[PDB]
Design an enzyme around this catalytic site. Structure first.
Site, short mmCIF file in Angstrom:
data_model
loop_
_atom_site.label_atom_id
_atom_site.label_comp_id
_atom_site.label_asym_id
_atom_site.label_seq_id
_atom_site.Cartn_x
_atom_site.Cartn_y
_atom_site.Cartn_z
N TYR A 21 0.85 -1.18 0.00
CA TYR A 21 0.00 0.00 0.00
C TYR A 21 0.88 1.23 0.00
CZ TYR A 21 0.82 0.86 4.98
OH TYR A 21 1.38 1.16 6.20
N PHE A 51 1.34 10.21 2.85
CA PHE A 51 1.68 9.98 4.24
C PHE A 51 2.32 8.63 4.52
CE2 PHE A 51 -1.61 7.08 5.76
CZ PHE A 51 -2.57 7.20 4.78
N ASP A 52 1.95 7.58 3.80
CA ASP A 52 2.57 6.29 4.06
C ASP A 52 2.86 5.60 2.74
OD1 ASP A 52 3.62 4.02 5.20
OD2 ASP A 52 1.84 3.46 6.32
N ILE A 86 -7.35 -0.64 10.11
CA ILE A 86 -8.53 0.19 9.94
C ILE A 86 -9.56 -0.49 9.04
CG2 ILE A 86 -7.31 2.34 10.35
CD1 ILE A 86 -7.41 2.72 7.25
N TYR A 137 -9.45 6.95 10.61
CA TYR A 137 -9.18 7.29 12.00
C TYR A 137 -10.30 8.13 12.62
CZ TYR A 137 -4.53 5.44 11.24
OH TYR A 137 -3.47 4.62 10.95
N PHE A 183 -6.01 5.47 -0.87
CA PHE A 183 -4.96 4.47 -0.85
C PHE A 183 -4.53 4.10 -2.26
CE2 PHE A 183 -5.87 2.54 3.56
CZ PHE A 183 -5.20 3.60 4.13
#
Lengths: 313, 107, 438
Positions: free
Chosen positions: B26, B36-37, B56, B82, B99
């Protein structure tokens, strides 16, 4: 410290933000374009992640006036379809970009750019609509109604272990919609080169050479003809010189081996206008009459004030 | 909640099962165009056991759909993320995720 | 003339469809002679890197000039703005081989001309304040016929090599590195006891050049004379007290993502807009694209957007950019129609485009604006806070050379454009005034 890195990190506006981005490169096939126009591409290898980043394949068109396509010295991150001097297409899930716009109108595959794909692309002359075909399938048309200003060309961008085939002339597979190929600007003298798309560099061991910018069409715009006034004292010599031109036009076909006849032919050497300037009526000789008239209008208009210094014959 | 584009398909029929651990890559980024990731980044393929309710919610809902090689886009609803709290430091309050998940294997 | 290959202008074709036409025109001009009548009658300043500003030494680089034109090549202090030309400051110190003159604060004739494909060169002695120019082994002399070209230049903030090409030219520099393959340093140079730049270093010296693409920037105090003010209701007034009045664009500093409006007062004709941050068009023009939807075929599927930037035009023009997720346009109490209500998730710079007719040209600011734009967002009374700027689209700033680009191979059969080895940036982007730097 938890209080700092709650109130100050995630907004990402106050302090800066940084990340690494893959070096975009775009390449154009030396054909400026003011009929309709059309090309193809086929993809050979993608290797979709030789980076830790999605590698891009933007396929499409661009304007010319303005347009510095600089690597990292253009818009955000380097790209294609990011300024409005650019119109491109192609993704894993093939949606376009045009001005850094992400709109995801579908296709009847939801295909990638895999290593086995055919991209048909067409630009319309003066009905400014661009449409792209994947494997002959129309891909749910998006582009309309642009600024037709500056020339046009294919751009196609790529940044990976990527090699693709131009089909521009070795055409391989090309549907006909609209129609005129990209092969219709290599006609007069020009060649089929493909360049780096505009090069403030040119890489070398010693020194990259430099480049002062540029100096920047098939609508014919000549000098105007009919709006020139003839005085009649010029018109006497004009009619006599039109007579001289018609008798030289008789002498031309005498030299080229022709014969007078009633049949208006060129396959049996019989020509019906070898008789005099006035004995031809004014529906076959008037094309020479007005030719000599407009020639003397231009001679009185091209700044060569030819006065009457001798006898007219 | 989760709204999935097919970025690259797999086969469509070998989609996962409970008691299995999926091996993904991912590279998730924000709604606003910011990353962010990325599990492409540290080169570790992320794994997680479906049914044990680790991750999540929208990520687990999207890993139920994808197949053995399908790459997709798990655009998650901010209450499925979140949430109104957000992740304290990375994800702001009431943010949306976009994503990019390339499902690879099963266990 | 369908698809006939006669889609050509006349001068661009061969000498085949010109023979009979030119010969018949000569025959008509011979009828005239038989009647007795005769027909009687911009810039790419390429410069080196500011950290290489040499300040005490004996330096040289040899510049190949290739094709004729504006080739102003020599040394400069790093304060040479690319926007104004070379030489007409106290900061540029260069030689113009074409037309045989050297540049400082105007003209002064010097040296000679150059054959198209020679290698010119420019020495500096920092210690003894003399700056010599060469050409092809021959020391270029004055009009007086003396070797020392420029004299008694102050050693201030160092000197950096500069080449200013013209319109359609090619230049080539030489930056050390290449001791055996120095062209004319081996003749004059080595024997005198000079050094190039990069005998020591192990890089390529990264260069900077100006861009054609204009980018906005603050209004520095040392402008021509343009004084934005900061007045507080909550005005940012103006003035353009100069003679130079082409067109001065104006951007307010920070965008809006996708309720409150915003009033522009016009004193004197004047455009108002909402720039999306990719607006880099600096002309006396009026220009910028419609993407249509698809319902898997189209057939309803038309209206998405157009944007790029935004258009408007007795006593005072009190024009108002009312916002939202859309846009509208009101002005002077009335509602100037034809609003461009389209923004999916865009960022919009509030902006104004104008020509200077007078001093005191503008003022700025049913609620009001700032609290939809800053961080605290009830804050209903408007106010200016000191991040606000009044940017000007300047034409050019220097930009990095990007020392490696991509390894690239274009080919013939299939025309195999081919790149295999990846290269990555290190690219930030400032978020508040959206643009990307590396």
């Amino acid at each position: 410290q938890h209080l700092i890195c709650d109130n100050l990190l995630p907004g990402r506006d106050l302090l800066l933000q940084t990340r690494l981005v893959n070096h975009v490169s775009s390449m154009r096939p030396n054909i400026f374009l003011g009929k309709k126009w059309y090309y193809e591409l086929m993809v050979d290898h993608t290797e979709p992640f030789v980076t830790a980043e999605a590698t891009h394949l933007r396929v499409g068109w661009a304007s010319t006036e303005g347009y510095s396509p600089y690597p990292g010295g253009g818009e955000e991150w380097g790209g294609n379809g990011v300024g409005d001097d650019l119109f491109s297409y192609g993704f894993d899930g093939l949606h376009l970009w045009s001005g850094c716009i992400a709109r995801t109108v579908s296709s009847p595959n939801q295909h990638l750019l895999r290593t086995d794909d055919v991209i048909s692309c067409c630009l319309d002359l003066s009905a400014p609509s661009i449409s792209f075909r994947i494997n002959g399938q129309p891909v749910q048309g998006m582009f309309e109604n642009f600024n037709i200003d500056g020339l046009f060309f294919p751009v196609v961008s790529f940044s990976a272990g990527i090699k693709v085939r131009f089909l521009l002339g070795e055409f391989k597979f090309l549907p006909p919609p609209g129609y005129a190929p990209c092969y219709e600007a290599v006609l007069p003298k020009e060649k089929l080169k493909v360049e780096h798309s505009r090069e403030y560099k040119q890489e070398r061991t010693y020194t990259r050479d430099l480049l002062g910018p540029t100096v920047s069409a098939f609508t014919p715009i000549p000098v105007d003809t009919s709006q020139i006034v003839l005085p009649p004292h010029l018109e006497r010599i004009r009619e006599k010189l039109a007579e001289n031109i018609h008798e030289l036009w008789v002498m031309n076909k005498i030299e080229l081996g022709w014969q007078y006849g009633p049949v208006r032919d060129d396959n049996k050497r019989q020509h019906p206008c070898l008789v005099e300037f006035s004995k031809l009526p004014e529906q076959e000789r008037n094309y020479n009459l007005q030719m000599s008239l407009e020639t003397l209008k231009t001679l009185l208009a091209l700044g060569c004030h030819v006065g009457i210094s001798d006898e007219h014959a | 909640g989760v709204e999935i584009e097919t970025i690259s398909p797999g086969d469509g029929r070998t989609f996962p099962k409970k008691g299995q651990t999926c091996v993904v890559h991912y590279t998730g980024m924000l709604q606003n165009g910011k990353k962010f990731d990325s599990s492409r980044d540290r080169n570790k393929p992320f794994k997680f056991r479906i049914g044990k309710q680790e991750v999540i919610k929208g990520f687990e809902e999207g890993a139920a759909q994808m197949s053995l090689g399908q790459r997709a886009k798990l655009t998650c609803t901010p209450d499925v993320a979140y949430g109104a709290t957000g992740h304290p430091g990375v994800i702001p309050p009431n943010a949306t995720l976009i994503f990019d998940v390339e499902l690879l294997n099963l266990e | 003339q369908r698809r006939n290959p006669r889609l050509v202008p006349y001068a661009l074709l061969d000498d085949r469809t010109k023979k009979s036409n030119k010969d018949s025109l000569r025959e008509a001009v011979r009828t005239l002679l038989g009647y007795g009548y005769n027909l009687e009658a911009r810039f790419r300043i390429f410069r080196a890197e500011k950290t290489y500003a040499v300040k005490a030494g004996r330096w040289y680089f040899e510049f190949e000039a290739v094709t004729a034109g504006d080739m102003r090549v020599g040394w400069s202090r790093p304060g040479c703005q690319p926007d104004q030309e070379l030489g007409s400051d106290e900061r540029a110190f260069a030689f113009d081989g074409f037309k045989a003159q050297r540049w400082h604060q105007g003209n002064e004739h010097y040296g000679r001309s150059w054959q198209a494909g020679d290698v010119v060169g420019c020495m500096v002695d920092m210690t003894e304040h003399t700056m010599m120019f060469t050409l092809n082994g021959e020391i270029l002399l004055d009009d007086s016929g003396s070797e020392l070209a420029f004299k008694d230049f102050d050693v201030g903030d160092g000197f950096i090599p500069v080449c200013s090409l013209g319109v359609a030219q090619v230049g080539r520099m030489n930056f050390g590195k290449d001791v055996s393959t120095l062209k004319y340093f081996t003749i004059c140079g080595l024997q005198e006891g000079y050094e190039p730049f990069a005998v020591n270093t192990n890089r390529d010296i990264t260069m900077w050049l100006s861009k054609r693409l204009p980018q906005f920037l603050q209004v520095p105090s040392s402008h021509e004379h343009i004084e934005v003010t900061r007045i507080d209701v909550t005005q940012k007034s103006f003035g353009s007290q100069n003679s130079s009045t082409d067109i001065m664009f104006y951007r307010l500093s920070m965008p809006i993502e996708c309720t409150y409006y915003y009033s522009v007062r016009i004193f004197p004709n004047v455009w108002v807009g909402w720039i999306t941050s990719d607006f880099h068009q600096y002309d006396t023009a009026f220009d910028l694209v419609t993407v249509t939807l698809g319902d898997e075929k189209g057939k309803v599927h038309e209206s998405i957007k157009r944007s790029n930037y935004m258009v408007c035009a007795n006593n005072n023009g009190l024009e108002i950019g009312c916002v939202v997720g859309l846009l509208t346009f009101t002005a002077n109490g009335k509602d100037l129609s034809t609003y461009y209500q389209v923004e999916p998730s865009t960022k919009l710079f509030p902006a104004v485009f104008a020509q200077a007719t007078s001093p005191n040209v503008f003022q700025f600011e049913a609620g009001l604006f700032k609290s939809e734009h800053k961080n605290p967002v009830p804050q209903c009374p408007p106010r200016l806070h000191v991040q606000f700027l009044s940017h000007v689209l300047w034409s050019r700033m220097p930009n990095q050379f990007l020392k490696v680009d991509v390894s690239r191979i274009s080919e013939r059969q299939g025309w195999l454009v081919q790149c295999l080895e990846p290269l990555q940036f290190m690219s930030l982007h400032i978020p508040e005034e959206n643009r990307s730097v590396d």
